[PDB]
Amino acid sequence: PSQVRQNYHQDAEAAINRQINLELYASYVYLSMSCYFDRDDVALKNFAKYFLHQSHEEREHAEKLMKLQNQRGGRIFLQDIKKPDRDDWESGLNAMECALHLEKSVNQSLLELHKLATDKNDPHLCDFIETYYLSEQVKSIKELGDHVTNLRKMGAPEAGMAEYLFDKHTLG
Amino acid sequence: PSQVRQNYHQDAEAAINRQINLELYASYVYLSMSCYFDRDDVALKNFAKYFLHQSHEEREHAEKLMKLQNQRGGRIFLQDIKKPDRDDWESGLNAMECALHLEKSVNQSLLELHKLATDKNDPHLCDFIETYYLSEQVKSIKELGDHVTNLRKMGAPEAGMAEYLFDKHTLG
Amino acid sequence: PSQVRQNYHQDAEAAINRQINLELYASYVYLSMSCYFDRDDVALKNFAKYFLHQSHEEREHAEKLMKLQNQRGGRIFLQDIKKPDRDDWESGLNAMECALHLEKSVNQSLLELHKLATDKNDPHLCDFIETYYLSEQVKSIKELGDHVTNLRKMGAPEAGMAEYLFDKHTLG
Amino acid sequence: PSQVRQNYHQDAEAAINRQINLELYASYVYLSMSCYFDRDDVALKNFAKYFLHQSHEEREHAEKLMKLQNQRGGRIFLQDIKKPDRDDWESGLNAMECALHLEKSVNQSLLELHKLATDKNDPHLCDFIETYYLSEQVKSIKELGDHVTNLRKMGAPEAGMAEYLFDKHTLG
Amino acid sequence: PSQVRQNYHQDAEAAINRQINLELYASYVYLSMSCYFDRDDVALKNFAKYFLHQSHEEREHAEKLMKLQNQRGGRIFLQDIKKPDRDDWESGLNAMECALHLEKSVNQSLLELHKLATDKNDPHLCDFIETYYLSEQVKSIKELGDHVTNLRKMGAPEAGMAEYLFDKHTLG
Amino acid sequence: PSQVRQNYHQDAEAAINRQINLELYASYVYLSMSCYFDRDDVALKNFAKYFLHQSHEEREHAEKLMKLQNQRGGRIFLQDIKKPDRDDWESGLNAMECALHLEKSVNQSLLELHKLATDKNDPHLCDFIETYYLSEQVKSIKELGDHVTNLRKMGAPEAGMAEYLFDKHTLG
Ligand code: NA
Ligand code: NA
Ligand code: NA
Ligand code: NA
Ligand code: NA
Ligand code: NA
């Protein structure tokens, strides 16, 4: 084992590698969404900026897990980053709804990771997940839920001004 | 076609999508290298920082191509980002040599993209590639070649102090 | 020939003179649009400001071509600047759509100029066009396409608040 | 009629449209002169700058008339901007003499516009012309007359140093 | 081949070496001219300063080509820098005329280099030449043409005050 | 003779012209060395910078002699600047050793020039040489000797880290 490794179960190391991939995947999904909103036929710059920021955030999340993996003496094993499920994200509302789904999926994975950490009596990993991931996820989910709610209430996407004005006032 | 599209051949659009993937792939390779140097049994923080910066740069390169694709009215089609060929990059020198190979490969792809742009009489794309990609690549290749040279001359990796001191003095 | 003239084909000189006229024409079209939005019965001040700025930009484009013509030892031959096709531009959306058409037309002329420059092996002129004109055009076309998209989505011009709010939020 | 229109005779509206065209024409003439002085075989940069500034000033004059037309509820009708009478302006002195002629012509048109405004009992228009146009014209005419005088006295254009030194000392 | 070399034809490498020599030669010619104007029997300090600056600029041009050669993995091969054709440059006008000839000659060489780069499908080199050399040359040629024009118009060199005053007002 | 010439022997004027050429030659040699260290397979940036600075210094030395020649009413006669003896300078140590040889050669020439000045009872020239050249040379020779010593002691060039570390610590 790594000279630093202590109380770091192989199952945790594997789960962290999986989580890294998921974070990178989420980054890629958000990048896809950002690019969609930059299309000339979509042209919602603040949706684009929002999702680009999310993409960058997810990359940071992945990098922080990579740092954790090395800190604990695990070994990072990267996997392909799968392309997002869609190229065309349909609408600001649909993208926000998909983002919410993605964030909940990531959260579910983090909760499973936390359960694993607890099961393996790895409090450092538990704490790491709780501290840096779970609160962030809850905040993200709430924010996306709020965005979805607002867009839906505003009549998006059928109401043409809804996404535009949400783009300006909420995302701008 | 997109309302903005003008003089943008489908072959160029496809080539740009391929280049986006290659840039994202290069980003991922450099991320892999960065993580390797952050291993406790490698522990070259400035190599890690160097490659992380390269990873971020490659992502920026990809994002700029995505912006180009949308600016020209092409449509971004993302593909899986393949995992890097290696998890273990062996040494600072070997990583720099692999980086040089990667950069030359990316450069070759950009040169092919430029040839395509010239062939399709797409001077905007030609100019974009020349302006933002080809000079950057040449600079990157030269810098990596310089690093490789220096590491080799210093006796890396067999000479234990070579990578350490290169990490401090060239990359620090 | 002019003492400075070198590698500057008469066909290029002529094409540049034509481009100057086209830029001045575009300036005039945008001035027409600006004035339209300043009508009391239209009263979209930020559309007016947008198009006035475009008018000024096009004049700058023309002046830069005039500077090029003299720099290369060609001789500027001015022609009448034709009045714009319309006095009444109908709506913010219609003006933006017409602007997009105009910009694409100007771009097409620049692409033809670039082809001529390449054909005459005039790399200075090629570079000048690429550097100062083609990227600007692509950006302009994309921006107008984005504006058109947004106005259309917002329901312009039938939806009374669309142009108003676009005027405030996008153009203000 | 326009909801704002009050005491604005159709003849005034027409005269203003004519004046707009004349100002734009004057702008174009001065642009032509500026370009001439930027020729490598003329190369009087401060003459070029002087006339370019005049061109910009005339454009501003036209824009201010357009603003007036809209303020009064008239409708701007643009016409072709005729090319200047000359491509080659011969000399700094000849250009200044032609500028003086042009300015006097513009002044004459403004005086006719003022007479029309007085005839139609349009004191706002009278005041506008007096305030923003007639004093400017007199100043411009005097300045050009002064320049012509000085250039003539200096021996322009036959005395080779005259235009050069006038360019440096009066226009620089 | 050099580890960095990619898409860099030997003919380009040779042409770059030739261009380096030509730039160094031009530097030397301008140094010769500068020294001439510093003679007590010529004593035009701003002509001297002008040409000295040009000499330094040409050296920078040569150094930038040397940097390019190394960046692309070519090898610099220096040749003798031939002495200038003249020790005595006769007059400010004659020097400016000779400078114009030299600049056009350098430009012609750069155009040939660009043609070679295009022929060898070396867009990096093409871009480098266009970006850093061809626009600079056109500007230089125009500036020298302007100087020649002005000196000729002022009556140089027979008119004793022409060079003196040009030295003060244009070059000072 | 020149109106300023006083106590300036033709032999001194000739010797100064020879010295100018030698300084320009030394400049060129150092430029050659600088370029060598910028090769990707050498890649010692601070050696490159060191020699480039020396090249610039030698050019300044030449220019100062040119100024002297004109100040004394001699006439500068330039000669070809011969290419350096080598394209490949082998190593940092070998370049420093060659630089030392070159500097000693230049010093020897300056000493001969001083002897000539003393022989011709030209104290201004003697003083000029002593003041601006001889102390500089001694300093340069000592500095290069120190560099050679250090590189030799460090085990250059066989000891791979020697040039690297000297580049960083002494030249950086
Ligand atoms: Na995340
Ligand atoms: Na890249
Ligand atoms: Na334009
Ligand atoms: Na006017
Ligand atoms: Na040059
Ligand atoms: Na020296």
XYZ file of N, CA and C and ligand atoms in Angstrom, chain C residues 19 23 26 57-58 61-62 103 106 110 133 137, ligand 3:
37
model
N -15.602 47.657 -51.790
C -15.880 47.345 -50.424
C -16.051 48.625 -49.635
N -19.311 49.406 -47.340
C -19.243 49.710 -45.941
C -19.946 51.039 -45.720
N -23.518 50.354 -45.892
C -24.007 49.722 -44.691
C -24.119 50.766 -43.595
N -19.677 52.219 -36.656
C -18.745 51.132 -36.831
C -18.508 50.913 -38.316
N -19.546 50.938 -39.131
C -19.389 50.658 -40.540
C -18.585 51.766 -41.187
N -15.161 51.019 -40.533
C -14.722 49.947 -41.397
C -14.339 50.506 -42.759
N -15.148 51.430 -43.270
C -14.867 52.045 -44.538
C -13.590 52.846 -44.448
N -25.371 42.366 -42.985
C -24.081 41.916 -42.508
C -23.633 40.682 -43.273
N -22.347 41.849 -46.542
C -21.065 42.490 -46.440
C -20.023 41.405 -46.257
N -16.736 40.468 -48.420
C -15.424 40.357 -47.844
C -14.846 39.006 -48.186
N -11.694 42.237 -40.664
C -13.022 42.239 -41.247
C -13.747 40.931 -41.008
N -17.118 40.391 -38.786
C -18.365 40.104 -39.451
C -19.015 38.908 -38.791
Na -18.474 46.839 -42.046
